[PDB]
Design a protein around this ligand. Structure first.
Ligand SMILES: N#Cc1nc(Nc2ccccc2)nc2[nH]cnc12
Length: 247
């Protein structure tokens, strides 16, 4: 409830809203993180918005969604700390970078794990997305977290004016995991939007099964109503028990 109940171990990374720090909970020694949000220049209406968003994250409990634990206020520095689960395997952006630099494609079994567990995370989100926002724990489990950049994962419909848009994004992510590059690449957003609207891309590398290529390709269909639902994804014969989470 107070920042003094935790000890900062070190800064994991400085993100958009502030730092992500690895912390230790004094009571039991539990390793967590917290995100540092400088609410200094808010904004009573904005602060109410933030409190409500924090509430609904407080209620999002799922093995494939980064767990919320606590929120702490420290007026001495205009900083709100969001205490969350620590994912010791890091984010997927780093996995993709490691693959690119070491010129080593990822195992199809890993891609099926990501597909399975992120589809389940999305199922929960729809009930109740890029490599940097997807984390691995220590037991092979996958957890969904949360102007200069290129919207590589932007779907055609969301580019004109939708849970199927999430399916398109997941397709882009799985494709990038397989090919170590996004399906649509360009140097300007006009070129990128053109490529996205045409919906053509290279097959994922041939070391990946036709079945995996087929489901990712379906997720990348230009028409949202042709992309598979979460339910249709999880029905795929590729997806087995061992691809799900395990405590
Ligand atoms: N930012 C961030 C962040 N990072 C981790 N773990 C991690 C471990 C090694 C390398 C990189 C990341 N876990 C998190 N949970 C919520 N935010 C998290």
């Amino acid at each position: 409830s107070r920042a003094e109940d935790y000890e900062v171990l070190y800064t994991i990374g400085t993100g958009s809203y502030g730092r992500c720090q690895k912390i230790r909970r004094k009571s039991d020694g539990k390793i967590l993180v917290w995100k540092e949000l400088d609410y200094g220049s808010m904004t009573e209406a904005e602060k109410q918005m933030l409190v409500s968003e924090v509430n609904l994250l407080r209620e999002l409990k799922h093995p494939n969604i980064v767990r919320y634990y606590d929120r702490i206020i420290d007026r001495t520095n205009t900083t709100l700390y969001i205490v969350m689960e620590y994912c010791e395997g890091g984010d997927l952006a780093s996995v993709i970078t490691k693959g690119t630099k070491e010129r080593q494609y990822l195992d199809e079994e890993f891609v099926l794990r990501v597909m399975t567990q992120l589809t389940l995370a999305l199922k929960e989100c729809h009930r109740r997305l890029k490599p940097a926002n997807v984390f691995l724990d220590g037991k092979q489990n996958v957890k969904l977290g949360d102007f200069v950049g290129t919207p590589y994962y932007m779907s055609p419909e969301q580019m004109n004016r939708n849970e199927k848009s999430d399916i398109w994004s997941l397709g882009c992510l799985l494709y990038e995991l397989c090919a170590l590059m996004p399906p649509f690449t360009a140097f300007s957003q006009k070129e990128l939007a053109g490529k996205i609207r045409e919906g053509k891309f290279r097959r994922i590398p041939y070391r990946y099964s036709d079945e995996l290529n087929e489901i990712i390709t379906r997720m990348l269909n230009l028409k949202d109503y042709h992309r598979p639902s979460v339910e249709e994804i999880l029905e795929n014969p590729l997806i087995l028990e061992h691809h799900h989470h395990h405590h």
